[PDB]
Scaffold this active site. Structure first.
Site, PDB file in Angstrom:
ATOM      1  N   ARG A  85      23.881   9.170   1.003  1.00 27.84           N
ATOM      2  CA  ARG A  85      23.696  10.393   1.770  1.00 27.84           C
ATOM      3  C   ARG A  85      23.965  11.601   0.878  1.00 27.84           C
ATOM      4  O   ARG A  85      24.882  11.603   0.043  1.00 27.84           O
ATOM      5  CB  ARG A  85      24.626  10.411   2.974  1.00 27.84           C
ATOM      6  N   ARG A  98      32.519  15.998   4.759  1.00 23.07           N
ATOM      7  CA  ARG A  98      31.182  15.698   5.276  1.00 23.07           C
ATOM      8  C   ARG A  98      30.304  16.965   5.259  1.00 23.07           C
ATOM      9  O   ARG A  98      30.806  18.070   4.989  1.00 23.07           O
ATOM     10  CB  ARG A  98      31.302  15.173   6.717  1.00 23.07           C
ATOM     11  N   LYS A 135      38.458  12.239   7.220  1.00 21.13           N
ATOM     12  CA  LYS A 135      37.331  13.075   6.841  1.00 21.13           C
ATOM     13  C   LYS A 135      37.334  14.383   7.625  1.00 21.13           C
ATOM     14  O   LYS A 135      37.639  14.396   8.817  1.00 21.13           O
ATOM     15  CB  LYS A 135      36.009  12.333   7.015  1.00 21.13           C
ATOM     16  N   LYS A 176      35.325  17.637   9.080  1.00 18.83           N
ATOM     17  CA  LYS A 176      33.989  18.092   9.493  1.00 18.83           C
ATOM     18  C   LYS A 176      34.005  19.572   9.893  1.00 18.83           C
ATOM     19  O   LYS A 176      34.842  19.985  10.707  1.00 18.83           O
ATOM     20  CB  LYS A 176      33.482  17.212  10.630  1.00 18.83           C
ATOM     21  N   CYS A 206      22.880   6.621  17.481  1.00 14.68           N
ATOM     22  CA  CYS A 206      23.285   6.458  16.087  1.00 14.68           C
ATOM     23  C   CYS A 206      22.460   5.330  15.449  1.00 14.68           C
ATOM     24  O   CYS A 206      21.746   4.604  16.146  1.00 14.68           O
ATOM     25  CB  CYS A 206      24.769   6.094  15.985  1.00 14.68           C
ATOM     26  N   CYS A 212      24.309  -0.821   9.998  1.00 10.67           N
ATOM     27  CA  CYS A 212      25.714  -0.492  10.143  1.00 10.67           C
ATOM     28  C   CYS A 212      26.607  -1.699  10.262  1.00 10.67           C
ATOM     29  O   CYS A 212      26.478  -2.483  11.192  1.00 10.67           O
ATOM     30  CB  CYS A 212      25.974   0.447  11.311  1.00 10.67           C
ATOM     31  N   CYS A 237      29.125   1.853  18.607  1.00  4.83           N
ATOM     32  CA  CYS A 237      30.497   1.380  18.653  1.00  4.83           C
ATOM     33  C   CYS A 237      31.309   2.634  18.950  1.00  4.83           C
ATOM     34  O   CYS A 237      30.772   3.744  18.890  1.00  4.83           O
ATOM     35  CB  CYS A 237      30.900   0.704  17.330  1.00  4.83           C
ATOM     36  N   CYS A 257      29.432   8.007  16.419  1.00  7.64           N
ATOM     37  CA  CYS A 257      28.450   8.762  15.642  1.00  7.64           C
ATOM     38  C   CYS A 257      27.283   9.332  16.450  1.00  7.64           C
ATOM     39  O   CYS A 257      26.730  10.363  16.089  1.00  7.64           O
ATOM     40  CB  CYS A 257      27.914   7.890  14.506  1.00  7.64           C
TER      41      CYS A 257
HETATM   42  C1  SRM Z   1      23.994   8.561  10.203  1.00  3.04           C
HETATM   43  C2  SRM Z   1      25.090   8.943  11.279  1.00  3.04           C
HETATM   44  C3  SRM Z   1      24.695   8.733  12.754  1.00  3.04           C
HETATM   45  C4  SRM Z   1      23.267   9.115  13.038  1.00  3.04           C
HETATM   46  O1  SRM Z   1      22.541   8.267  13.582  1.00  3.04           O
HETATM   47  O2  SRM Z   1      22.871  10.252  12.716  1.00  3.04           O
HETATM   48  C5  SRM Z   1      26.366   8.138  11.014  1.00  3.04           C
HETATM   49  C6  SRM Z   1      26.419   6.849  10.544  1.00  3.04           C
HETATM   50  C7  SRM Z   1      27.580   6.131  10.222  1.00  3.04           C
HETATM   51  N1  SRM Z   1      28.843   6.617  10.324  1.00  3.04           N
HETATM   52 FE1  SRM Z   1      29.461   8.349  11.275  1.00  3.04          FE
HETATM   53  N2  SRM Z   1      27.458   8.889  11.321  1.00  3.04           N
HETATM   54  C8  SRM Z   1      27.055  10.175  11.687  1.00  3.04           C
HETATM   55  C9  SRM Z   1      27.833  11.080  12.342  1.00  3.04           C
HETATM   56  C10 SRM Z   1      29.125  10.929  12.802  1.00  3.04           C
HETATM   57  C11 SRM Z   1      29.693  11.622  13.984  1.00  3.04           C
HETATM   58  C12 SRM Z   1      29.003  12.778  14.690  1.00  3.04           C
HETATM   59  C13 SRM Z   1      29.040  14.083  13.904  1.00  3.04           C
HETATM   60  O3  SRM Z   1      29.745  14.156  12.881  1.00  3.04           O
HETATM   61  O4  SRM Z   1      28.355  15.037  14.297  1.00  3.04           O
HETATM   62  C14 SRM Z   1      30.903  11.064  14.292  1.00  3.04           C
HETATM   63  C15 SRM Z   1      31.781  11.433  15.440  1.00  3.04           C
HETATM   64  C16 SRM Z   1      32.641  12.682  15.234  1.00  3.04           C
HETATM   65  C17 SRM Z   1      33.962  12.360  14.585  1.00  3.04           C
HETATM   66  O5  SRM Z   1      33.998  12.198  13.357  1.00  3.04           O
HETATM   67  O6  SRM Z   1      34.972  12.244  15.294  1.00  3.04           O
HETATM   68  C18 SRM Z   1      31.036   9.932  13.343  1.00  3.04           C
HETATM   69  C19 SRM Z   1      32.144   9.108  13.231  1.00  3.04           C
HETATM   70  C20 SRM Z   1      32.293   8.081  12.340  1.00  3.04           C
HETATM   71  C21 SRM Z   1      33.548   7.241  12.133  1.00  3.04           C
HETATM   72  C22 SRM Z   1      34.836   7.443  12.852  1.00  3.04           C
HETATM   73  C23 SRM Z   1      35.652   8.444  12.068  1.00  3.04           C
HETATM   74  C24 SRM Z   1      37.018   8.667  12.653  1.00  3.04           C
HETATM   75  O7  SRM Z   1      37.506   9.810  12.567  1.00  3.04           O
HETATM   76  O8  SRM Z   1      37.614   7.706  13.184  1.00  3.04           O
HETATM   77  C25 SRM Z   1      33.239   6.320  11.170  1.00  3.04           C
HETATM   78  C26 SRM Z   1      34.053   5.168  10.637  1.00  3.04           C
HETATM   79  C27 SRM Z   1      35.017   5.696   9.611  1.00  3.04           C
HETATM   80  O9  SRM Z   1      34.653   6.617   8.850  1.00  3.04           O
HETATM   81  O10 SRM Z   1      36.150   5.185   9.562  1.00  3.04           O
HETATM   82  C28 SRM Z   1      31.832   6.607  10.705  1.00  3.04           C
HETATM   83  C29 SRM Z   1      31.082   5.793   9.893  1.00  3.04           C
HETATM   84  C30 SRM Z   1      29.737   5.769   9.666  1.00  3.04           C
HETATM   85  C31 SRM Z   1      28.966   4.854   8.755  1.00  3.04           C
HETATM   86  C32 SRM Z   1      28.856   5.576   7.380  1.00  3.04           C
HETATM   87  C33 SRM Z   1      29.498   3.409   8.740  1.00  3.04           C
HETATM   88  C34 SRM Z   1      30.445   3.031   7.605  1.00  3.04           C
HETATM   89  O11 SRM Z   1      31.578   3.545   7.559  1.00  3.04           O
HETATM   90  O12 SRM Z   1      30.058   2.209   6.757  1.00  3.04           O
HETATM   91  C35 SRM Z   1      27.655   4.783   9.524  1.00  3.04           C
HETATM   92  C36 SRM Z   1      26.493   4.487   8.642  1.00  3.04           C
HETATM   93  C37 SRM Z   1      25.456   3.735   9.460  1.00  3.04           C
HETATM   94  C38 SRM Z   1      24.186   3.474   8.673  1.00  3.04           C
HETATM   95  O13 SRM Z   1      23.914   2.306   8.345  1.00  3.04           O
HETATM   96  O14 SRM Z   1      23.461   4.438   8.379  1.00  3.04           O
HETATM   97  N3  SRM Z   1      31.356   7.653  11.470  1.00  3.04           N
HETATM   98  N4  SRM Z   1      29.916   9.838  12.592  1.00  3.04           N
HETATM   99  C39 SRM Z   1      25.663  10.367  11.139  1.00  3.04           C
HETATM  100  C40 SRM Z   1      25.730  10.628   9.630  1.00  3.04           C
HETATM  101  C41 SRM Z   1      26.336  11.991   9.523  1.00  3.04           C
HETATM  102  C42 SRM Z   1      26.351  12.491   8.107  1.00  3.04           C
HETATM  103  O15 SRM Z   1      25.260  12.782   7.585  1.00  3.04           O
HETATM  104  O16 SRM Z   1      27.445  12.599   7.523  1.00  3.04           O
HETATM  105  S1  SF4 Z   2      28.840   4.664  16.089  1.00  5.59           S
HETATM  106 FE1  SF4 Z   2      29.465   2.701  15.182  1.00  5.59          FE
HETATM  107  S2  SF4 Z   2      27.470   1.574  15.171  1.00  5.59           S
HETATM  108 FE2  SF4 Z   2      26.860   3.712  15.351  1.00  5.59          FE
HETATM  109  S3  SF4 Z   2      26.521   4.336  13.229  1.00  5.59           S
HETATM  110 FE3  SF4 Z   2      28.664   4.935  13.836  1.00  5.59          FE
HETATM  111  S4  SF4 Z   2      29.907   3.276  13.020  1.00  5.59           S
HETATM  112 FE4  SF4 Z   2      27.776   2.426  13.089  1.00  5.59          FE
END
Ligand code: SRM
Ligand code: SF4
Ligand code: K
Length: 456
Positions: A3, A65, A101, A103, A320, A326, A365, A369
């Site tokens: 990314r 991020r 992280k 944001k 997501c 994922c 999950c 996301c």
């Molecule tokens: C691509 C995306 C969702 C989408 O369909 O657009 C995404 C995809 C994933 N997210 Fe995210 N997140 C995405 C927005 C977010 C959001 C929403 C937002 O930021 O607007 C959240 C919720 C808000 C928040 O952070 O509270 C989010 C909360 C997470 C978490 C939980 C973090 C936490 O604070 O507990 C994880 C897991 C972790 O990092 O431990 C994570 C982890 C991941 C990972 C990188 C899985 C991993 O750790 O290996 C996922 C990759 C999936 C894949 O195969 O592509 N992602 N993730 C978004 C990528 C954003 C970016 O470009 O950086």
């Molecule tokens: S919500 Fe869970 S399943 Fe969906 S992209 Fe984020 S880590 Fe993967």
């Protein structure tokens, strides 16, 4: 899984051609996936950094991020300044080791397309006479939860106060550093800013920020949001310029039979004067099209299937990535959404609300996301084919939806929505959204203080 760091989602046509090539020739899936944080991802990379670096892009020890910025403000002139600031905050924060992280976003009312309540730090732009004069700072949003763990919760951001434009970077640095210092040292699931604020108190945290920044916050200046959706189609920008926002389902750019989405975007990139903007709703804006160029651009988008009309419901739905890539996925999200919305569309038609929309999101999950924890109707993956159904958020995204039913299947979800959409269609007041209605009608209790009343 790579990314890129792309503040505000702004990417040039040259940069696009470079990413389109790599996506097609060097990855297993061959797609470009637009994310909801205004950037893109390649899936199954089989060298990318050289490709990135050559066109001026850098792929993100750094708990940072992508910094978001409202993509298509009603007052078009404000975008340039706001974007300038998102870019500055981005570079300013670039490598301290944050626990979790961090944001950040730059928001231009009345649009909350970037979904501010899902973020740690938010600068809400305040403009006077077409010029930005400062920012209202909101801190503490975050959506990740853990199933059945009542010590985790989604939280909305808290208002700290107003600051003049000149103090932006000092304040940004100060919030980051106190979170770093006060953040939980013992446990990672409690290290996020939303937890720190609840532990020490907003005022305590606020006072520290003022101390470190060397400023005192002014009272919050008035601001209101009217929606979070993109402005699909043509909108008039500044001068003789126009912006064409293309709806891209799940933001998945790939050539499908009879729908060459990827090639179409490449063709447009070859003739496009300005650049593109990746939105927080996983869509794409062909920005700064001269009126003279409108027909050319429209011709390609139309032929490529990029302008295929969908319902307002589909335009306001999100999911997501989830499976197949994922590793943390529990239930399908991206691959489930299209057919799921096909069903919701029927339900909307059945009740005579085909022209309406419900902000509906599916997250694979509890990490959240897909931002289901800020939707009017949110589905949170619990296991293959099973989701927790949350109801009660609102259209603007300032309220967390409470869990309504737990661990149910699609057929069970549809049966419940059929009943509720039916009631809304008949019993709703004028201009009343689905979420607000469920709260008003007593179908679900609202979440008033997440850290304390999110869980039943
Ligand atoms: C691509 C995306 C969702 C989408 O369909 O657009 C995404 C995809 C994933 N997210 Fe995210 N997140 C995405 C927005 C977010 C959001 C929403 C937002 O930021 O607007 C959240 C919720 C808000 C928040 O952070 O509270 C989010 C909360 C997470 C978490 C939980 C973090 C936490 O604070 O507990 C994880 C897991 C972790 O990092 O431990 C994570 C982890 C991941 C990972 C990188 C899985 C991993 O750790 O290996 C996922 C990759 C999936 C894949 O195969 O592509 N992602 N993730 C978004 C990528 C954003 C970016 O470009 O950086
Ligand atoms: S919500 Fe869970 S399943 Fe969906 S992209 Fe984020 S880590 Fe993967
Ligand atoms: K989309």
């Amino acid at each position: 899984l790579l990314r890129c760091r792309l503040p505000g989602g702004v990417i040039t046509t040259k940069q696009w051609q470079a990413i389109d090539k790599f996506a097609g020739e060097n990855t297993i899936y061959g797609s470009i996936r637009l994310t909801n944080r205004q950037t893109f991802q390649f899936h199954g990379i089989l060298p990318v950094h050289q490709m990135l670096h050559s066109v001026g892009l850098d792929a993100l020890n750094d708990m940072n991020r992508n910094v978001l910025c409202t993509s298509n403000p009603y007052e078009s002139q404000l975008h340039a300044e706001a974007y300038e600031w998102a870019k500055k905050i981005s570079e300013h924060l670039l490598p301290t080791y944050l626990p979790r992280k961090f944001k950040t976003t730059v928001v231009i009312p009345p649009q909350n397309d970037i979904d501010l309540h899902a973020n740690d730090m938010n600068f809400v732009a305040i403009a006077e006479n077409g010029k930005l004069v400062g920012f209202n700072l909101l801190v503490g949003g975050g959506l990740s939860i853990e199933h059945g763990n009542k010590k985790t919760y989604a939280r909305t951001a808290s208002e700290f106060g107003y600051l003049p434009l000149e103090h932006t970077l000092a304040v940004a640095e100060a919030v980051v550093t106190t979170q770093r210092d006060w953040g939980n040292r013992t446990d990672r699931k409690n290290a996020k800013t939303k937890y720190t604020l609840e532990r020490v108190g907003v005022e305590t945290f606020k006072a520290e920020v003022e101390r470190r920044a060397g400023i005192k916050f002014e009272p919050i200046r008035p601001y209101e949001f009217t929606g979070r959706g993109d402005r699909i189609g043509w909108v008039k920008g500044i001068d003789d310029n126009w912006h064409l926002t293309l709806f891209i389902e799940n933001g998945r750019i790939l050539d499908y039979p009879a729908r060459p989405l990827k090639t179409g975007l490449l063709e447009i990139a070859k003739i496009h004067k300005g650049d593109f903007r990746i939105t927080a709703n996983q869509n794409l804006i062909i920005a700064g099209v001269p009126e003279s160029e409108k027909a050319k651009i429209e011709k390609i988008a139309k032929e490529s299937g990029l302008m295929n009309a969908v319902t307002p419901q589909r335009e306001n739905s999100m999911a997501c990535v989830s499976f197949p890539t994922c590793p943390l996925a529990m239930a399908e999200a991206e691959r489930f959404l299209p057919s799921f919305i096909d069903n919701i569309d029927n339900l909307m038609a059945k009740h005579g609300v085909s022209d309406e929309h419900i902000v509906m999101r599916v997250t694979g999950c509890p990490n959240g996301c897909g931002r289901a924890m800020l939707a009017e109707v949110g589905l949170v993956g619990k296991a293959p084919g099973r989701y927790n159904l949350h109801l009660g958020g609102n259209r603007i995204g300032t309220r967390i939806p409470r869990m309504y039913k737990e661990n149910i299947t699609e057929p069970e979800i549809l049966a419940s929505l059929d009943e509720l959409i039916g009631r809304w269609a008949k019993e709703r007041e004028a201009g009343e959204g689905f979420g607000d209605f469920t709260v008003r009608a007593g179908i679900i209790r609202p979440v008033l203080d997440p850290a304390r009343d999110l869980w039943d």
